[PDB]
Short mmCIF file of C-alpha atoms in Angstrom, two decimals:
data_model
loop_
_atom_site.label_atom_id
_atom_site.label_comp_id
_atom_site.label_asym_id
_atom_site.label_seq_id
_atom_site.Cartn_x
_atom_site.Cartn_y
_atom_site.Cartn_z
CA UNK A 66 186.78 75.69 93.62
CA UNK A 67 184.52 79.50 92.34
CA UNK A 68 181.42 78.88 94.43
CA UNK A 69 181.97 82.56 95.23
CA UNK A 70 182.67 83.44 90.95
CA UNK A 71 179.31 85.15 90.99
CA UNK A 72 178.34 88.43 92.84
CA UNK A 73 180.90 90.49 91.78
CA UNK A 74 179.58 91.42 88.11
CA UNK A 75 176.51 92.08 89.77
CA UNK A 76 177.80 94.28 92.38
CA UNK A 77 179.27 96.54 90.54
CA UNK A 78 175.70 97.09 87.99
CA UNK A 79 173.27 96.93 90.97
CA UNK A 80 175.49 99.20 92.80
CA UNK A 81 174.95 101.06 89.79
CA UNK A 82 171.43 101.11 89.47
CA UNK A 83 170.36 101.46 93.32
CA UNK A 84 172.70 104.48 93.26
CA UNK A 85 170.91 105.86 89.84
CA UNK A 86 167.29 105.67 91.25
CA UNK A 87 168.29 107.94 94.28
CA UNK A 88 170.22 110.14 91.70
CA UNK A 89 166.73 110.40 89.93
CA UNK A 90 165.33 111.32 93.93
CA UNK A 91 168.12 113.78 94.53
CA UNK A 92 167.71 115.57 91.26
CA UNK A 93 164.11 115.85 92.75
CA UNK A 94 165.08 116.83 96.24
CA UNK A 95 166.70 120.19 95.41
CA UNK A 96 165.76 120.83 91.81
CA UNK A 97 162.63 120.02 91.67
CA UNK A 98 162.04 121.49 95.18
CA UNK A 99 163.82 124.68 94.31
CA UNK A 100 162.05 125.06 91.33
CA UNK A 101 159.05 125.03 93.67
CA UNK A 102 160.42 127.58 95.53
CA UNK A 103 160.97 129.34 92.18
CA UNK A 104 157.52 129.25 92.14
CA UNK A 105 157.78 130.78 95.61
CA UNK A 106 160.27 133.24 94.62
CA UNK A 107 157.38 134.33 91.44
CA UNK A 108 154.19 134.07 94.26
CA UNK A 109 156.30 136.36 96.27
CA UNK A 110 155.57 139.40 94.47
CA UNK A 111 152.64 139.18 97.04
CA UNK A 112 155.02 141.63 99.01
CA UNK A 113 155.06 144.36 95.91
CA UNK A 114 150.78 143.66 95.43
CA UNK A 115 149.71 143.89 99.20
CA UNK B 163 148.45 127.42 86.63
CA UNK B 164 150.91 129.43 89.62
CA UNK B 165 151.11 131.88 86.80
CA UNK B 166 148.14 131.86 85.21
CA UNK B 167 146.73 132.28 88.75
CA UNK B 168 149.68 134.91 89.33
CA UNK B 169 147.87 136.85 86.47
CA UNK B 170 143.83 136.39 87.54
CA UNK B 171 144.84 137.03 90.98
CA UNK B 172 146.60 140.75 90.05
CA UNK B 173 143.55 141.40 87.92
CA UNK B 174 141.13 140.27 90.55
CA UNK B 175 142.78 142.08 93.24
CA UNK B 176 143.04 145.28 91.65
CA UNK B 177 139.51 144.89 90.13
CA UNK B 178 138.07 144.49 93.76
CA UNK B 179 139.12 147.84 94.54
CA UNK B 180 136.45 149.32 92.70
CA UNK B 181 133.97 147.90 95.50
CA UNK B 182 136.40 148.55 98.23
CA UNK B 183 136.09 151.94 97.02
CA UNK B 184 132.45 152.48 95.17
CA UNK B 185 131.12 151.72 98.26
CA UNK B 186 131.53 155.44 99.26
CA UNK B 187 132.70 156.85 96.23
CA UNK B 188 129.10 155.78 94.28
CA UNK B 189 127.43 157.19 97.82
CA UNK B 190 129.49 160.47 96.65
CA UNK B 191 127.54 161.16 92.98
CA UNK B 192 124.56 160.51 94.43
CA UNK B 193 125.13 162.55 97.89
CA UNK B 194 126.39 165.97 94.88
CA UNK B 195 122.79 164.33 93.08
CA UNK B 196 121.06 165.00 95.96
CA UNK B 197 122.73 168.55 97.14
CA UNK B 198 121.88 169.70 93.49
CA UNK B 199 118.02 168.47 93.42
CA UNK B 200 117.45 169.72 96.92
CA UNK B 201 119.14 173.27 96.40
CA UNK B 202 116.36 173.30 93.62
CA UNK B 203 113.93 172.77 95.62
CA UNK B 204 114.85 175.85 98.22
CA UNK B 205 115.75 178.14 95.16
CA UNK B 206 111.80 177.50 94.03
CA UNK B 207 111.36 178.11 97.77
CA UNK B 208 112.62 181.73 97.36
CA UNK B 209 111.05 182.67 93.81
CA UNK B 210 107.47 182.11 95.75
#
Protein backbone atom coordinates (compact mmCIF):
# COMPACT_ATOMS: atom_id res chain seq x y z
CA UNK A 1 0.00 0.00 0.00
CA UNK A 2 3.43 2.87 1.12
CA UNK A 3 5.93 1.56 -1.41
CA UNK A 4 6.41 5.30 -1.96
CA UNK A 5 6.52 5.98 2.41
CA UNK A 6 10.20 6.65 1.98
CA UNK A 7 11.87 9.65 0.15
CA UNK A 8 10.19 12.26 1.65
CA UNK A 9 12.16 12.47 5.14
CA UNK A 10 15.07 12.35 3.10
CA UNK A 11 14.19 15.03 0.79
CA UNK A 12 13.69 17.46 2.92
CA UNK A 13 17.55 16.74 4.96
CA UNK A 14 19.43 16.13 1.66
CA UNK A 15 17.79 19.09 0.27
CA UNK A 16 19.22 20.45 3.25
CA UNK A 17 22.61 19.46 3.08
CA UNK A 18 23.26 19.81 -0.86
CA UNK A 19 21.95 23.36 -0.34
CA UNK A 20 24.46 23.87 2.85
CA UNK A 21 27.67 22.76 0.94
CA UNK A 22 27.03 25.47 -1.81
CA UNK A 23 26.17 27.91 1.10
CA UNK A 24 29.77 26.99 2.38
CA UNK A 25 30.88 27.80 -1.74
CA UNK A 26 28.90 31.01 -1.83
CA UNK A 27 30.21 32.32 1.44
CA UNK A 28 33.53 31.67 -0.54
CA UNK A 29 32.48 33.18 -3.81
CA UNK A 30 32.04 36.79 -2.61
CA UNK A 31 33.56 36.82 0.85
CA UNK A 32 36.30 35.13 0.51
CA UNK A 33 36.87 36.65 -2.98
CA UNK A 34 36.24 40.14 -1.72
CA UNK A 35 38.39 39.74 0.99
CA UNK A 36 40.94 39.04 -1.75
CA UNK A 37 40.18 42.02 -3.29
CA UNK A 38 40.59 43.59 0.18
CA UNK A 39 43.83 42.50 -0.26
CA UNK A 40 43.63 44.31 -3.59
CA UNK A 41 42.12 47.31 -2.15
CA UNK A 42 45.56 47.23 0.64
CA UNK A 43 48.17 46.30 -2.61
CA UNK A 44 46.61 49.27 -4.20
CA UNK A 45 48.42 51.80 -2.39
CA UNK A 46 50.82 50.97 -5.35
CA UNK A 47 49.06 54.15 -6.86
CA UNK A 48 50.21 56.51 -3.66
CA UNK A 49 54.11 54.56 -3.82
CA UNK A 50 54.73 54.79 -7.69
CA UNK B 1 52.54 37.66 3.83
CA UNK B 2 50.45 40.55 1.31
CA UNK B 3 51.33 42.70 4.23
CA UNK B 4 54.34 41.69 5.39
CA UNK B 5 55.36 41.97 1.71
CA UNK B 6 53.28 45.39 1.67
CA UNK B 7 55.92 46.47 4.34
CA UNK B 8 59.48 44.96 2.69
CA UNK B 9 58.30 46.15 -0.55
CA UNK B 10 57.85 50.13 0.78
CA UNK B 11 61.19 49.68 2.49
CA UNK B 12 62.83 48.13 -0.50
CA UNK B 13 61.48 50.56 -2.85
CA UNK B 14 62.38 53.55 -1.10
CA UNK B 15 65.79 52.03 -0.10
CA UNK B 16 66.59 51.54 -3.92
CA UNK B 17 66.50 55.10 -4.39
CA UNK B 18 69.70 55.59 -2.88
CA UNK B 19 71.28 53.75 -6.06
CA UNK B 20 68.84 55.30 -8.39
CA UNK B 21 70.30 58.34 -7.08
CA UNK B 22 74.12 57.65 -5.74
CA UNK B 23 74.79 56.80 -9.02
CA UNK B 24 75.38 60.55 -9.78
CA UNK B 25 75.06 61.98 -6.56
CA UNK B 26 78.39 59.75 -5.18
CA UNK B 27 79.96 60.91 -8.85
CA UNK B 28 79.13 64.54 -7.27
CA UNK B 29 81.63 64.33 -3.88
CA UNK B 30 84.08 62.97 -5.76
CA UNK B 31 83.73 65.36 -9.01
CA UNK B 32 83.92 68.74 -5.71
CA UNK B 33 87.05 65.98 -4.50
CA UNK B 34 88.55 66.36 -7.56
CA UNK B 35 87.88 70.32 -8.35
CA UNK B 36 89.46 70.88 -4.79
CA UNK B 37 92.77 68.58 -5.33
CA UNK B 38 93.25 69.90 -8.82
CA UNK B 39 92.77 73.72 -7.91
CA UNK B 40 95.75 72.72 -5.54
CA UNK B 41 97.65 71.68 -7.88
CA UNK B 42 97.38 75.10 -10.18
CA UNK B 43 97.58 77.29 -6.93
CA UNK B 44 101.27 75.44 -6.40
CA UNK B 45 101.42 76.21 -10.14
CA UNK B 46 101.35 80.00 -9.39
CA UNK B 47 103.54 80.14 -6.06
CA UNK B 48 106.53 78.73 -8.50
Amino acid sequence: QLNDLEKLYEEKQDALMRHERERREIITYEQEMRYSKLVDAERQVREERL
Amino acid sequence: QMQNRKEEIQILEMEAQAAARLRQVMELREKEDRQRMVRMDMDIHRQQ
